[PDB]
Amino acid sequence: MWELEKDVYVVEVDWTPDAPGETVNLTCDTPEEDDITWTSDQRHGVIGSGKTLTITVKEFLDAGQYTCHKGGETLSHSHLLLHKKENGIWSTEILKNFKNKTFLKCEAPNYSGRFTCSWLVQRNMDLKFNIKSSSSSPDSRAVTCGMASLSAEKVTLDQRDYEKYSVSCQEDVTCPTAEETLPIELALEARQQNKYENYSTSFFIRDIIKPDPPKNLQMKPLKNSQVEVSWEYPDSWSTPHSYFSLKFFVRIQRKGCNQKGAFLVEKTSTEVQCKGGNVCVQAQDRYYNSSCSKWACVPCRVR
Amino acid sequence: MWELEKDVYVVEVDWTPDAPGETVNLTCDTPEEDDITWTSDQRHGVIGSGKTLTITVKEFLDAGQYTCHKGGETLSHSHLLLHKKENGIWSTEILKNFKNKTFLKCEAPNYSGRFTCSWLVQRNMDLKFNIKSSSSSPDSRAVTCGMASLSAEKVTLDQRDYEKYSVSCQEDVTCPTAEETLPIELALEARQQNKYENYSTSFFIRDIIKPDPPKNLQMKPLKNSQVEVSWEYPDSWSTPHSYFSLKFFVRIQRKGCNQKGAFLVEKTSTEVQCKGGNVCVQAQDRYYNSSCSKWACVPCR
């Protein structure tokens, strides 16, 4: 086994039923060496006596909070977790994958080094989430990640509505304009009732840029039939715009980048003659095939 | 004196002839302490006996490779170098200065942090060159420089063709759009057979930008009198051009920025009426008074 934190350990178990479990020592962190007994949460009563308790673990019933006992008082506790491994493959049962089979969707609204990663859960009961840089060595990328959180947005797939947890992360060393030489390698420690699973992902910020919708969309009726649609760069997006230039796509509708026909405009305004419908605009990084922003739309209504 | 490398030292000497030299101890790095003798390259034969040889140094004859000798075998060697100082001024005699009176001409074809520094030599016989950041401390700029090398191109001044040594350098921390707050402070240690001289230079990359000539100059014959001359940014030049915008100067001739007449154009093409002669174009950084690129020319036909 291997330690995760104070009084918390993780047992690598081969789940194939023909293979035997792993025997593990649990020693009580106390000066005493007589009158030492153990009580598990999974099993009522005492299971073993002596300072060092050696137990075989193959099922979740052999996990949990093992707590010592002497003279009727608790001495020290130790919590165990299981990491399933079937045919030499680590379990991925806590999280729900996306259509693309990945578990960690990460997106960045600018080159500021800040980004956010989201994931889907199979169930929402007694979950603990931690995320940290998976390399943590010279020639790596220092990233500080805040706490995870449930997003109001539920994500629906083939029929089932899965819940989504997101987390905000910030890179420490940041020169926005610098070309990315080495990818950000992240890892997610996911824990449920006693099951331990971790996920990995390596990405460049440049490859996960998704700008925000253009701001202050204006629809100024100019000519009897024509209207000037205007907008501005999103306040979120990186400055200076002279370097971080977004190109925009204009569309007309009758009430990832999805391109079903649109006229390209790199300026922040365009005249259009629609006479009914809705004018919509999405933004994209000009010099890179980054994901496009969500459409911002105005109704076509002329004087 | 002060050490430069293993068994190589440098003596600061006041060259004025009325001032006395500097006495320096040279001890042989050997356990033995008897039968120790010294042989210099400057002087044939033995000069001193004993483990510690104390010698006065004022001329180059008092420099060179002092080598020990015991029982017919060499023990250890020590090489000395001189840094002349006349009227409290350090010598600058190895290098030849440029037209601008500076010794280290440094230029950058883009903002990539890469640049190259060149210098001229008075003579080319037994030269050793080293170049490094002259500050190399917090509040400095980390730069890694490769080896120097002689350029086939000779540079002629007044009648004399001086040879040119160049070196390629790369800054480690490079943040393109960030404004340069502190200059790159470089230094060049130059040695000729026994003379030690060092040179310094402090510059911003923004101040040494010299683009390359515009590429693919074309002459499209227009209708009735005009011809459209076109060109493109140099592949060397920094991307994205929307930020790094070059302005061009076009001129026509019938045969540092040197201007005997040229009209400014910021686009990559212009109509002109020359009918014989040559159309030429040079590039310059739009937002800064950087040095202009060399002229690219096509014959007007």
Ligand SMILES: *[C@@H]1O[C@H](CO)[C@@H](O[C@@H]2O[C@H](CO)[C@@H](O[C@@H]3O[C@H](CO)[C@@H](O)[C@H](O[C@H]4O[C@H](CO)[C@@H](O)[C@H](O)[C@@H]4O)[C@@H]3O)[C@H](O)[C@H]2NC(C)=O)[C@H](O)[C@H]1NC(C)=O
């Ligand atoms: C993702 O999951 C995998 C699989 O669960 C996980 O790999 C395992 O990580 C542990 C912890 O790093 C490894 O255990 C180590 O094993 C060696 C040799 O047996 C021991 O020497 C280590 O202990 C010493 O060093 C530690 C660190 O200095 C100390 O904490 C400790 O007190 C000892 O001094 C340690 O027990 C285990 O071998 C791997 N197994 C495999 C097959 O990969 C991976 O780390 C997880 N990653 C994340 C980001 O969650």
Ligand SMILES: *[C@@H]1O[C@H](CO)[C@@H](O[C@@H]2O[C@H](CO)[C@@H](O[C@@H]3O[C@H](CO)[C@@H](O)[C@H](O[C@H]4O[C@H](CO)[C@@H](O)[C@H](O)[C@@H]4O)[C@@H]3O)[C@H](O)[C@H]2NC(C)=O)[C@H](O)[C@H]1NC(C)=O
């Ligand atoms: C350009 O050339 C000039 C002139 O040669 C040069 O100035 C001199 O630099 C030397 C560098 O060694 C200075 O010498 C030091 O002097 C102090 C006090 O006397 C000593 O303590 C120093 O010795 C330490 O370092 C030695 C080598 O590691 C150790 O062996 C020793 O034990 C000490 O730790 C050292 O000798 C000298 O003082 C200056 N001159 C002046 C006027 O101050 C200049 O540095 C050169 N610049 C460049 C960019 O090349």
Ligand SMILES: [Cl-]
């Ligand atoms: Cl991703």
